């Protein structure tokens, strides 16, 4: 059972990577809370197609080279309420099925 752990007040790291097989051109990516559902993400935590209205103040960030397929999620200043399954989902254009990763985050008290 793969679980990713962070301690309260730290930043969590949830790895997520895809093959950038459509070069140069943007690729839909979502992250949400809960296992990946039928389509896209449930309970979306961040956007990758454009910057959110409160971009600067959000705790959710993609700090990797997402251009090169690193869409790993940072969750800043975690609390116990952050524990749960997260969905990372990528749709390379034309693909038969999205690639869907369910990532389990366990926050531990400080």
């Amino acid at each position, epitope marked *: 059972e793969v679980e990713y752990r962070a301690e309260v007040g730290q930043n969590a790291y949830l790895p997520c990577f895809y093959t950038p097989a459509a070069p140069g051109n943007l690729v839909p990516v979502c992250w949400g809370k809960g296992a990946c559902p039928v389509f896209e993400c449930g309970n979306v935590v961040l*956007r990758t197609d454009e910057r959110d209205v409160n971009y600067w103040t959000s705790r959710y960030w993609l700090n990797g080279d997402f251009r090169k397929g690193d869409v790993s999620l940072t969750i800043e200043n975690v609390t116990l309420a952050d524990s749960g399954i997260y969905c990372c989902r990528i749709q390379i254009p034309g693909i038969m099925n999205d690639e869907k990763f369910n990532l389990k985050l366990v926050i531990k008290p400080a």
Partner: antibody, heavy 123, light 109 residues
Framework: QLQLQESGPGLVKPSETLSLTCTVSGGSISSRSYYWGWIRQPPGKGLEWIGSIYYSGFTYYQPSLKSRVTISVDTSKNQFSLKLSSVTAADTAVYYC???????????????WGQGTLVTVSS | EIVLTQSPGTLSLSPGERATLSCRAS???????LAWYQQKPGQAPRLLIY???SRATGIPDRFSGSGSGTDFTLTISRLEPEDFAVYYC?????????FGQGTRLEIKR
């Protein structure tokens, strides 16, 4: 309130491409946690989902139509569009655009809808 | 795909009575992810119920949805003449999204 409005030809020749546009007013077609769909209704028949595109760009299609269907968004114009190639009389229908959201959990009910536009495929 | 079969195909009831419309699925519909629509003549479908049992905003209390697994109902109590319409169910628990073929409800007089 969001309002949707279909536009495009009412008559298309067999083997040519059907193109429709949906213009969205009263809200942004790029708002988080919305999806935008095309659903058609042959005369006297029921409803068939054609496909949807999410605010984030994720697109999903009716499998039997995927090889012929393109759905895309123009955020500059607040419009989304449908192209259906190689049409036959099977594609005669009222075509609706529709939207759903804002969703928390995944959902894919539709409300509101456009008004519908009839396309007849005939020579 | 999940095929939705509505019954009866046509219904004719007096105002003030209760209509019970059935939607039955070829396989279990995940998470009660079933919606109901009302389609009046010449109009787009109007969402009544989502998630099997949640009323859409602006929909009167006399519309109710229930059911699970493969058997879902729409109930319209205290029928009114303006309830004449074709009613459709929709599932979104799996792709492709699918709809039933409709029940036509006539209001007697």
């Amino acid at each position: 309130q969001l309002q949707l409005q279909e536009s495009g030809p009412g008559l298309v020749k067999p083997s040519e491409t059907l193109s429709l546009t949906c213009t969205v007013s009263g809200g942004s077609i790029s708002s988080r946690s919305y999806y935008w769909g095309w659903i058609r209704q042959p005369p006297g028949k029921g409803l068939e989902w054609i496909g949807s595109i999410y605010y984030s760009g994720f697109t999903y299609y009716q499998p039997s139509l995927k090889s012929r269907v393109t759905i895309s968004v123009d955020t500059s114009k607040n419009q989304f569009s449908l192209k259906l190639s190689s049409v036959t009389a099977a594609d005669t229908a009222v075509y609706y655009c529709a939207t759903g959201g804002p969703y928390g959990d995944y959902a894919h009910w539709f409300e509101p809808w456009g008004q519908g536009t009839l396309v007849t495929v005939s020579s | 795909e999940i095929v939705l079969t509505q019954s009866p195909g046509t219904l004719s009831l007096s105002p003030g009575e209760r209509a019970t419309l059935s939607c039955r699925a070829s396989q279990s519909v995940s998470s009660s992810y079933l919606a109901w629509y009302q389609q009046k003549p010449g109009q787009a479908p109007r969402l009544l119920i989502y998630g099997a049992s949640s009323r859409a905003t602006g929909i009167p209390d006399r519309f109710s949805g229930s059911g699970s697994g493969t058997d879902f109902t729409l109930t319209i109590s205290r029928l009114e003449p303006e309830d004449f319409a074709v009613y459709y169910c929709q599932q979104y628990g799996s792709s492709p999204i699918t709809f039933g073929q409709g029940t036509r409800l006539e209001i007697k007089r």
